Structure 1
Amino acid sequence: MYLAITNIVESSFFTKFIIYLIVLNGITMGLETSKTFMQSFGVYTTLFKQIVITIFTIEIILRIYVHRISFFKDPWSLFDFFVVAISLVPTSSCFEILRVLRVLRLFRAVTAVPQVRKIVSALISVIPGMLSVIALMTLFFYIFAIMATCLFGERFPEWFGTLGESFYTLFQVMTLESWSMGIVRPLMEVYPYAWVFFIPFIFVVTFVMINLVVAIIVDAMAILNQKEE
């Protein structure tokens, strides 16, 4: 009946069986990289793949059939429905296998007891300031990318062509690798005063990326210092 199926979806036996077969498919996705193992057991492994994908679709849509609107409030349901919906089509560049990320559900069972609850609570509570931090960083990258494209546009072939590639190059200047010997020394061969555009930028955006660490450390100590009042 309706009540019996809503019991049987929440059965720990069959749910742990879903976890069993999904970590099984995770390790045979680890085995698919070894081409010889796919030469040896190929039809068996693609049978494993196709069967666990169709029964994965079966169990997710049965989770819909039991909890048509009751399935809405769970962010883990947001996670697994993202995994089903975005990775529904396999006629693409083989990237179905990110559904292995479904096994992240098992790491709910480690979030409870051994002191990582405070860390994940800090990670959850750091959201409404870190989003404003990344919006400020997007504004800085926007204005500096448009300034860099107005300056170093024509005479530079590949690092400042479009808006997206100029954003990419200034992002790589933020990641702090070879801005001198990959970006500056070709640029000072033409423009002798392009250094005064980079030197504030490498300061300000890495300083904001340090301020993010400051914000998450004070957010991870606010819950600690809550315990004295």
Structure 2
Amino acid sequence: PGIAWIALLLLVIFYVFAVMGTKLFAQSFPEWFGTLGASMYTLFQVMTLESWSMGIARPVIEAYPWAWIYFVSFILVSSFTVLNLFIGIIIESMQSAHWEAEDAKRIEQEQRAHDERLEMLQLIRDLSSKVDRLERRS
């Protein structure tokens, strides 16, 4: 398992949407989705939202009016699984640094004093033992 297990998926979301888009607009926007690699590129351009809509979608949408769904969806997914990936890093680097350290040091400072209390506790039975013997010898 893991976090970069998304870098797997994203590039498959990609693979998917590329092939999907290529099958459609290969026909009539072979400028962009002429080929797979072409769609690949385009879709990374779209990933980046560098004229994503006016450049690509809207033209494509004029020809294929529903395409809006394709482009709008790809985006929400593309971006979403990046946000989902990017944060998995905020986390796996956030708590890589002072959060492994602390958990260990308090796992340590805590068993430090189940140590202290418990035995120090003991001398008190050892005392309720020495003294125990003496209300007897009273």
Return the letter of the residue paired with 1:225.
Answer: W
Does 2:66 match 1:197? Answer: no
Separation in structure 1 between the aligned mates of residue 49 and residue 30 of structure 2, nearest angstrom: 21
State the identity %: 54
2:16 aligned residue = 143
Return the letter of the residue paired with 2:100.
Answer: Q
SS at match of 1:177: coil
- Among residues 76, 79, 82, which one is paired with 1:209 in the alignment? 82
SS at match of 2:62: coil
Q: How far apart are 1:152 and its partner, in Å? A: 1.0
Alignment deviations for residues 36-82 of structure 1 (CA, whole Å, 9 cap, x no partner): xxxxxxxxxxxxxxxxxxxxxxxxxxxxxxxxxxxxxxxxxxxxxxx
Does 2:105 match 1:225? Answer: no
Q: How far apart are 1:228 and its partner, in Å? A: 2.3
Does 2:52 match 1:171? Answer: no
Q: Detail structure 1 runs of 4+ shifted over 6 Å in the superposition.
A: none
Separation in structure 2 between the aligned mates of residue 165 and residue 157 of structure 1, nearest angstrom: 8
Superposition CA RMSD, Å:
1.6
Rg larger for? 2
- Among residues 47, 53, 61, which one is paired with 1:180 in the alignment? 53
TM-score, structure 1 as length reference: 0.42
Return the letter of the residue paired with 1:206.
Answer: S
Q: Which runs of 5+ in 1 are unaligned?
A: 1-127
Instruction: Point out the structure with the larger helix share.
Output: 2
Alignment deviations for residues 163-200 of structure 1 (CA, whole Å, 9 cap, x no partner): 10111111111111211110022112211111011111
Separation in structure 1 between the aligned mates of residue 64 and residue 91 of structure 2, nearest angstrom: 43
Separation in structure 2 between the aligned mates of residue 131 and residue 196 of structure 1, nearest angstrom: 28
Return the letter of the residue paired with 1:228.
Answer: E
Larger relative contact order, structure 1 or 2 (CA cutoff 8 Å, min sep 6): 2
2:6 aligned residue = 133
Q: Which runs of 5+ in 2 are unaligned?
A: 104-138
Q: How far apart are 1:130 and its partner, in Å? A: 4.6
Compared CA separation, residues 177 and 162, structure 1 to 2 (3 A): same
Separation in structure 2 between the aligned mates of residue 215 and residue 131 of structure 1, nearest angstrom: 9
Aligned residues between the structures: 102
Return the letter of the residue paired with 1:174.
Answer: M
Return the letter of the residue paired with 1:226.
Answer: E
| Equivalence map 1:143-162=2 (5 Å) | 143-162=16-35
